[PDB]
Design a protein around this nucleic acid. Sequence first.
RNA 1: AGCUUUGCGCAGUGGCAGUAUCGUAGCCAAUGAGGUCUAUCCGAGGCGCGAUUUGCUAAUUGAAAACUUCCCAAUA
RNA 2: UUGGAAAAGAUUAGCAUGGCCCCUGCGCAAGGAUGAC
Lengths: 141, 42, 50, 106, 13
Amino acid sequence: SYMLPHLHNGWQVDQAILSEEDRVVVIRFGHDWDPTCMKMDEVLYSIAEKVKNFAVIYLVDITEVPDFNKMYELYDPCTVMFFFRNKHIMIDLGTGNNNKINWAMEDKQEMVDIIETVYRGARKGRGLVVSPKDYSTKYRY
Amino acid sequence: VTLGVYLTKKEQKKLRRQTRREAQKELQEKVRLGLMPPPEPK
Amino acid sequence: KPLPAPLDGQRKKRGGRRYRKMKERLGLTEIRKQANRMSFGEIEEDAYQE
Amino acid sequence: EDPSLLEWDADDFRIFCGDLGNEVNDDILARAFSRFPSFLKAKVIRDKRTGKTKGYGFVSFKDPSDYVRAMREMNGKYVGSRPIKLRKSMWKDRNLDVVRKKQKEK
Amino acid sequence: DIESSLKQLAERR
RNA sequence: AGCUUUGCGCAGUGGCAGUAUCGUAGCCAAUGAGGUCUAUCCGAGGCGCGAUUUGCUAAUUGAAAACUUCCCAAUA
RNA sequence: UUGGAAAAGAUUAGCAUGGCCCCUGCGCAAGGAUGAC
């Protein structure tokens, strides 16, 4: 499956980041073999037709284009990062850093809310968007 | 020859609303662009 | 099933017999008193009335 | 007094271009081509001896109808690091204040 | 289109 | 010759404004949508969408809430 | 007149505009009634 077209070329991915400016660009640097990236792709497909009018999500393979995993240092098996009009917005997840999500978010509503908040912060220009979630914990009990 | 036909009541209401809106918009465009000051709204 | 764009209102300039009717009928003004105060000194209701 | 409007008194359509970034549209604020003279005799005002722009900048188009059409079509459009909008200029010196005081209380 | 990528992913898993 | 009917569009006035005003773009619809009266009678709306748009003024918070320089010092 | 240092414009409320329902003056269609030594 993986209906989201993965930008094979690194320069193609960079141009795609420079392609759209009025919406949210999310790149899934996870390798499609691992099950975690499969769950991330499933979550994206859940929000494929929802956040489409406000965002443009693309997949990525760190093996295909390695420059993204060597310059941005995306060492996680499946890290979700955002870039808005040549500005990598930071989501205030609270996991020590804000460059990636790094978690296999199995909740479609949580992903949709995060996308909406990221879009609102990008519109407001805040480079560090306050994520409306307590991602610092496992959020399970 | 050149002859007309009847109209519709719903079409009449739509035409009246659209014509009033278009007249207001045309007046605003003509008197707000900067060619002639508009009067006070009465 | 599209999703509405993350956009809000531009600015507020109208009010009174143009937007006040909706804010008085639909979003009608509640008591706004005797229901928001807590009286941090005393205790009106029971300890576990809730 | 402020001897500034002497270089801009052209009976044109003047608009308020402000609430933008400090460096956004620093020198190309009039580079747009929505009309014939763009923002003629207009620039971005700034706070002197600080290297910073104080927001509002001059926006004066010599064509009134073209200015109105461009402002309506480009209200809050993407302008550099901060999309700014347009609104009617004040141009209210003391020659307007005297007449306003005369016509208000009388 | 997506068929080739899906087949490639499946063949490695 | 004066007036006037459906009244129309302009401009003024009065009132209404979430049930309403309208597009209704999805659908039926002058080739009948609907029924306790009227049933061999009546004959044009209804289901769902979305808002009630144009500007000015005061205030309000904030250090600043915006329209072309500024805080300073003996004089003129 | 002379002289030294230099919130990416927001919240809240009314007023008219604006939307429709009524009338008026205007403009005129098709007509309706009448005066015509």
